[PDB]
Amino acid sequence: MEIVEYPDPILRAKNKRIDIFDENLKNLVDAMFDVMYKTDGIGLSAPQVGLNVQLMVFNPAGEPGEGKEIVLVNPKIKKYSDKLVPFDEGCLSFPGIYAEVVRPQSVKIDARDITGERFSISLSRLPARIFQHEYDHLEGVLFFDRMTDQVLDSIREELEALEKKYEEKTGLPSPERVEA
Ligand SMILES: O=C(Cc1c[nH]c2ccc(Br)cc12)NO
Ligand SMILES: [Zn+2]
Ligand SMILES: [Zn+2]
Ligand SMILES: [Zn+2]
Ligand SMILES: [Zn+2]
Ligand SMILES: [Zn+2]
């Protein structure tokens, strides 16, 4: 298994509905949760393992045995709160990079679960926060898109480094450059 990283395009590709709700789907969520636990994270959205399908899993506590291992599939934000708050985020598709992103305090959400049931959770604190972070992955949108002109100024050079690693490995030019 392996985490996809920035500039890699699978990060921007349209993400599909899921509809069979089979056993493979259980099996996927093992491996998303386990890769998460292995890289010490608190969320992970499926295109970060190379699958373009709306599926995110996560667990605020982010340590085994602790918190609560939530799964949303086909999320949609019904509502976003007015309240706005900063927070240093990291994202695994950007090894080692943390920069402050500013986002809505709470969200209401509609979504299916691992057996198909729709449902309807609201969400705050860290939970909500991650939710959104993975919620963006589902939808083409990476954390530095959410940063303020100044902040991004602080990571230009790092994400540039990434673009080059991609370029060295792939032979191809970086399908997207942050000087853009
Ligand atoms: O790469 C990841 C997981 C992750 C790791 N460290 C974090 C700190 C803040 C936030 Br919000 C998310 C993370 N999700 O796409
Ligand atoms: Zn592997
Ligand atoms: Zn299908
Ligand atoms: Zn497991
Ligand atoms: Zn930890
Ligand atoms: Zn991420």
Numbering used by the authors: 1 to 180
Original authors' sentences:
Here, we explore the precise structural inhibitory mechanism of actinonin, which is a slow, tight-binding inhibitor of peptide deformylase (PDF), a metal cation-dependent enzyme. PDF is the first enzyme in the N-terminal methionine excision pathway, an essential and ubiquitous process that contributes to the diversity of N-terminal amino acids. Actinonin is a natural product with antibiotic activity that inhibits PDF by mimicking the structure of its natural substrates (nascent peptide chains starting with Fo-Met-Aaa, where Fo is a formyl group and Aaa is any amino acid) in their transition state.
In this respect, we studied the binding of compound 6b, a PDF ligand that does not exhibit a reactive group at this position. We observed that this compound binds strongly to both EcPDF (KI*  = 63±6 nM) and AtPDF (KI*  = 400±35 nM) but, unlike actinonin, does not display slow, tight binding as KI*  =  KI. This impact on binding is consistent with the absence of the hydrogen bond involving the first carbonyl group of the ligand. The 3D structure of AtPDF was determined after soaking the compound in crystals of the free, open AtPDF form. Upon binding, 6b induced a complete conformational change, identical to that observed with actinonin (“O” state). This result further suggests that the conformational change is not induced initially by the formation of this hydrogen bond and that the encounter complex is primarily driven by the fit within the S1' pocket. The 3D structure also revealed that both the P1' and the hydroxamate groups are bound similarly to the corresponding groups of actinonin. As expected, no additional bonding occurs, especially around the backbone nitrogen of Ile42. Taken together, these data allow us to conclude that the conformational change observed upon ligand binding is triggered primarily by binding in the S1' pocket. As revealed by the binding of 6b, the one carbon longer metal-binding group fits, immediately upon recognition of the P1' group, in the S1' pocket and forms a bidentate complex with the metal cation, mimicking the transition state as a result.
